[PDB]
Design an enzyme around this catalytic site. Structure first.
Site, PDB file in Angstrom:
ATOM      1  N   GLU A  35       0.977  -1.192   0.111  1.00  0.00           N
ATOM      2  CA  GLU A  35       0.024   0.038  -0.081  1.00  0.00           C
ATOM      3  C   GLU A  35       0.873   1.294  -0.052  1.00  0.00           C
ATOM      4  O   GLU A  35       0.559   2.140  -0.903  1.00  0.00           O
ATOM      5  CB  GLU A  35      -1.025  -0.038   1.229  1.00  0.00           C
ATOM      6  CG  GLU A  35      -2.147  -1.051   1.065  1.00  0.00           C
ATOM      7  CD  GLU A  35      -3.093  -0.438   0.334  1.00  0.00           C
ATOM      8  OE1 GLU A  35      -3.167   0.411  -0.378  1.00  0.00           O
ATOM      9  OE2 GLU A  35      -4.143  -1.415  -0.009  1.00  0.00           O
ATOM     10  N   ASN A  46      -6.656   9.710  -5.916  1.00  0.00           N
ATOM     11  CA  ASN A  46      -7.582   8.877  -6.724  1.00  0.00           C
ATOM     12  C   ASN A  46      -8.407   9.951  -7.696  1.00  0.00           C
ATOM     13  O   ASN A  46      -8.466  10.990  -7.503  1.00  0.00           O
ATOM     14  CB  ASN A  46      -8.628   8.146  -5.744  1.00  0.00           C
ATOM     15  CG  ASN A  46      -8.013   7.109  -4.686  1.00  0.00           C
ATOM     16  OD1 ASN A  46      -6.891   6.681  -5.263  1.00  0.00           O
ATOM     17  ND2 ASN A  46      -8.382   7.083  -3.437  1.00  0.00           N
ATOM     18  N   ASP A  48     -11.497   9.882  -8.213  1.00  0.00           N
ATOM     19  CA  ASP A  48     -12.851  10.427  -7.765  1.00  0.00           C
ATOM     20  C   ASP A  48     -12.852  11.585  -6.840  1.00  0.00           C
ATOM     21  O   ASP A  48     -13.710  11.841  -6.136  1.00  0.00           O
ATOM     22  CB  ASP A  48     -13.465   9.414  -7.227  1.00  0.00           C
ATOM     23  CG  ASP A  48     -12.517   8.743  -6.143  1.00  0.00           C
ATOM     24  OD1 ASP A  48     -11.967   9.385  -5.371  1.00  0.00           O
ATOM     25  OD2 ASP A  48     -12.743   7.459  -5.953  1.00  0.00           O
ATOM     26  N   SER A  50     -10.827  11.826  -4.080  1.00  0.00           N
ATOM     27  CA  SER A  50     -10.227  11.438  -2.832  1.00  0.00           C
ATOM     28  C   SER A  50      -8.753  11.084  -2.830  1.00  0.00           C
ATOM     29  O   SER A  50      -8.269  11.111  -4.041  1.00  0.00           O
ATOM     30  CB  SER A  50     -11.169  10.292  -2.396  1.00  0.00           C
ATOM     31  OG  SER A  50     -10.740   8.986  -2.928  1.00  0.00           O
ATOM     32  N   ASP A  52      -5.632   8.889  -0.597  1.00  0.00           N
ATOM     33  CA  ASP A  52      -5.289   7.710   0.133  1.00  0.00           C
ATOM     34  C   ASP A  52      -4.329   8.195   1.073  1.00  0.00           C
ATOM     35  O   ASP A  52      -3.149   8.864   0.622  1.00  0.00           O
ATOM     36  CB  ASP A  52      -5.032   6.361  -0.425  1.00  0.00           C
ATOM     37  CG  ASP A  52      -6.295   5.906  -1.210  1.00  0.00           C
ATOM     38  OD1 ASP A  52      -7.470   5.953  -0.535  1.00  0.00           O
ATOM     39  OD2 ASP A  52      -6.185   5.217  -2.229  1.00  0.00           O
ATOM     40  N   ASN A  59      -8.399   6.178   3.168  1.00  0.00           N
ATOM     41  CA  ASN A  59      -9.331   6.979   2.117  1.00  0.00           C
ATOM     42  C   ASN A  59     -10.100   8.296   2.594  1.00  0.00           C
ATOM     43  O   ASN A  59     -10.707   8.033   3.878  1.00  0.00           O
ATOM     44  CB  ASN A  59     -10.293   6.339   1.420  1.00  0.00           C
ATOM     45  CG  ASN A  59     -10.659   7.139   0.127  1.00  0.00           C
ATOM     46  OD1 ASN A  59     -10.197   6.991  -0.863  1.00  0.00           O
ATOM     47  ND2 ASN A  59     -11.874   7.483   0.214  1.00  0.00           N
ATOM     48  N   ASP A 101     -15.853  -3.398   9.062  1.00  0.00           N
ATOM     49  CA  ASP A 101     -16.566  -2.613   8.344  1.00  0.00           C
ATOM     50  C   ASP A 101     -17.550  -3.517   7.427  1.00  0.00           C
ATOM     51  O   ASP A 101     -18.227  -3.008   6.345  1.00  0.00           O
ATOM     52  CB  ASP A 101     -16.267  -1.248   7.871  1.00  0.00           C
ATOM     53  CG  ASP A 101     -17.298  -0.600   7.420  1.00  0.00           C
ATOM     54  OD1 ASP A 101     -18.384  -0.120   8.457  1.00  0.00           O
ATOM     55  OD2 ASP A 101     -17.298   0.048   6.200  1.00  0.00           O
TER      56      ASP A 101
END
Length: 129
Positions: A35, A46, A48, A50, A52, A59, A101
């Site tokens: 990662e 990202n 979109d 967002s 990380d 995120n 989650d």
């Protein structure tokens, strides 16, 4: 800060990640390697809107607030900048919420593609835990 493999493994085991939710320490070290390459300052944008953040690439759309992501939720209730520190406490505490989650470690795409179903114990080889 760039952690050494066993240095990170020790820090994670101390924060209770070993076998957390049934995921061995090796899974966590492997996820961190792919990662962020053990770099606490790693940030990836990202497409979109967002981003990380940190060693576990958490995120900004759902987990931390960076003040520039439309539709942010901030479920870990912390600024994303706090996930870029040298001590992994914030990242681990938030990761514990993410893993329970409903998707297990599948939440981390790098773990799914490079760690899932492999011999993850290899990631803690040579470490004195």
């Amino acid at each position: 800060k760039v952690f050494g493999r066993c240095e990170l493994a020790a820090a994670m085991k101390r924060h209770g990640l070993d076998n957390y939710r049934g995921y061995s320490l090796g899974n966590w070290v492997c996820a961190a390697k792919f990662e962020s390459n053990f770099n606490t300052q790693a940030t990836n944008r990202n497409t979109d809107g967002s981003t990380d953040y940190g060693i576990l690439q958490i995120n900004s759309r759902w987990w931390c607030n960076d003040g520039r992501t439309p539709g942010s939720r901030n479920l870990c209730n912390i600024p994303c900048s706090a996930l870029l520190s040298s001590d992994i406490t914030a990242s681990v505490n938030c990761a514990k919420k993410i893993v329970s989650d409903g998707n297990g470690m599948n939440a981390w795409v790098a773990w799914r593609n490079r760690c899932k179903g492999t011999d993850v114990q290899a990631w803690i080889r040579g470490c004195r835990l």
